[PDB]
Swiss-Prot record:
Positions of disulphide bridges: C6-C127, C30-C115, C64-C80, C76-C94
EC number(s) given by UniProt: 3.2.1.17
Name assigned to this protein: Lysozyme C
Active site, per annotation: E35, D52
Amino acid sequence: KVFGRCELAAAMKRHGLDNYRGYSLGNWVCAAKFESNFNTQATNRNTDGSTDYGILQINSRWWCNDGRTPGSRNLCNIPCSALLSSDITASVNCAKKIVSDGNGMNAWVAWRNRCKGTDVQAWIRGCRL
Protein backbone atom coordinates (compact mmCIF):
# COMPACT_ATOMS: atom_id res chain seq x y z
CA LYS A 1 0.00 0.00 0.00
CA VAL A 2 1.15 3.51 -0.92
CA PHE A 3 -0.25 5.80 1.83
CA GLY A 4 -1.20 9.42 1.62
CA ARG A 5 0.73 11.78 3.78
CA CYS A 6 -2.06 12.56 6.28
CA GLU A 7 -3.39 9.05 5.91
CA LEU A 8 -0.12 7.69 7.30
CA ALA A 9 0.00 10.20 10.13
CA ALA A 10 -3.49 9.27 11.28
CA ALA A 11 -2.79 5.55 11.39
CA MET A 12 0.49 6.34 13.16
CA LYS A 13 -1.24 8.53 15.79
CA ARG A 14 -3.97 5.86 16.27
CA HIS A 15 -1.17 3.42 17.02
CA GLY A 16 0.59 5.52 19.66
CA LEU A 17 3.55 7.08 17.84
CA ASP A 18 2.68 10.75 18.44
CA ASN A 19 5.37 11.74 20.93
CA TYR A 20 6.35 8.11 21.40
CA ARG A 21 9.69 8.45 23.33
CA GLY A 22 9.31 12.24 22.83
CA TYR A 23 9.14 12.24 19.02
CA SER A 24 6.26 14.32 17.65
CA LEU A 25 4.10 12.81 14.96
CA GLY A 26 5.87 14.73 12.20
CA ASN A 27 9.18 12.93 13.01
CA TRP A 28 7.59 9.60 12.19
CA VAL A 29 5.91 10.81 9.01
CA CYS A 30 9.12 12.52 7.87
CA ALA A 31 10.95 9.23 8.54
CA ALA A 32 8.41 7.25 6.51
CA LYS A 33 8.59 9.68 3.62
CA PHE A 34 12.34 9.41 2.98
CA GLU A 35 12.71 5.75 3.97
CA SER A 36 9.80 4.33 1.96
CA ASN A 37 7.98 7.17 0.15
CA PHE A 38 4.93 5.97 2.19
CA ASN A 39 5.02 2.60 0.40
CA THR A 40 4.43 -0.36 2.76
CA GLN A 41 6.02 -2.71 0.13
CA ALA A 42 9.40 -0.95 -0.18
CA THR A 43 12.47 -3.16 0.18
CA ASN A 44 16.19 -2.19 0.02
CA ARG A 45 19.39 -4.04 0.25
CA ASN A 46 22.01 -2.84 2.71
CA THR A 47 25.75 -3.25 1.92
CA ASP A 48 26.15 -5.64 4.86
CA GLY A 49 23.84 -8.08 2.99
CA SER A 50 20.72 -7.44 5.07
CA THR A 51 17.64 -5.80 3.63
CA ASP A 52 15.39 -2.99 4.96
CA TYR A 53 11.67 -3.63 4.99
CA GLY A 54 8.59 -1.52 4.77
CA ILE A 55 7.18 1.90 5.48
CA LEU A 56 9.94 2.49 8.06
CA GLN A 57 12.65 0.38 6.39
CA ILE A 58 13.20 -1.95 9.34
CA ASN A 59 16.14 -4.20 8.86
CA SER A 60 16.85 -7.92 9.05
CA ARG A 61 20.20 -7.76 10.90
CA TRP A 62 18.43 -7.11 14.21
CA TRP A 63 14.71 -6.72 13.88
CA CYS A 64 13.11 -9.40 11.68
CA ASN A 65 13.93 -12.65 9.88
CA ASP A 66 13.88 -12.76 6.11
CA GLY A 67 15.58 -16.15 5.95
CA ARG A 68 18.64 -14.87 4.10
CA THR A 69 20.37 -12.67 6.67
CA PRO A 70 23.32 -14.24 8.50
CA GLY A 71 24.19 -13.29 12.07
CA SER A 72 20.72 -11.94 12.30
CA ARG A 73 18.77 -11.35 15.45
CA ASN A 74 14.96 -11.27 15.11
CA LEU A 75 14.38 -8.95 18.03
CA CYS A 76 10.91 -8.00 16.92
CA ASN A 77 9.92 -11.69 16.52
CA ILE A 78 8.41 -11.27 13.09
CA PRO A 79 9.21 -12.47 9.61
CA CYS A 80 10.30 -9.45 7.65
CA SER A 81 7.36 -9.95 5.30
CA ALA A 82 4.99 -8.93 8.10
CA LEU A 83 6.51 -5.45 7.62
CA LEU A 84 5.36 -5.06 3.98
CA SER A 85 1.70 -5.42 4.90
CA SER A 86 -1.00 -2.88 4.19
CA ASP A 87 -1.55 -3.15 7.93
CA ILE A 88 1.17 -1.10 9.66
CA THR A 89 0.62 -2.69 13.07
CA ALA A 90 3.80 -4.79 13.04
CA SER A 91 5.99 -2.01 11.58
CA VAL A 92 4.72 0.46 14.20
CA ASN A 93 5.26 -2.06 17.03
CA CYS A 94 8.77 -2.89 15.84
CA ALA A 95 9.55 0.89 15.54
CA LYS A 96 8.62 1.36 19.16
CA LYS A 97 11.23 -1.25 20.10
CA ILE A 98 13.91 0.14 17.78
CA VAL A 99 13.39 3.70 18.95
CA SER A 100 13.93 2.55 22.57
CA ASP A 101 17.22 0.65 22.19
CA GLY A 102 19.43 3.68 23.09
CA ASN A 103 20.03 5.95 20.09
CA GLY A 104 16.40 7.04 19.59
CA MET A 105 15.33 7.96 16.08
CA ASN A 106 19.05 8.16 15.12
CA ALA A 107 18.68 4.39 14.39
CA TRP A 108 17.00 5.52 11.15
CA VAL A 109 19.94 7.23 9.47
CA ALA A 110 17.56 8.93 7.00
CA TRP A 111 15.79 10.58 9.89
CA ARG A 112 19.05 11.79 11.41
CA ASN A 113 20.37 13.11 8.07
CA ARG A 114 17.05 14.39 6.64
CA CYS A 115 14.51 14.98 9.44
CA LYS A 116 16.41 15.64 12.65
CA GLY A 117 16.39 19.41 13.31
CA THR A 118 14.06 20.36 10.46
CA ASP A 119 10.55 21.80 10.50
CA VAL A 120 9.01 18.34 11.06
CA GLN A 121 5.47 19.53 11.93
CA ALA A 122 5.10 20.56 8.25
CA TRP A 123 4.52 16.80 7.58
CA ILE A 124 1.37 16.72 9.74
CA ARG A 125 0.27 20.11 8.30
CA GLY A 126 -3.16 20.32 6.65
CA CYS A 127 -4.18 17.02 8.26
CA ARG A 128 -7.44 16.08 10.09
CA LEU A 129 -5.78 14.25 13.00
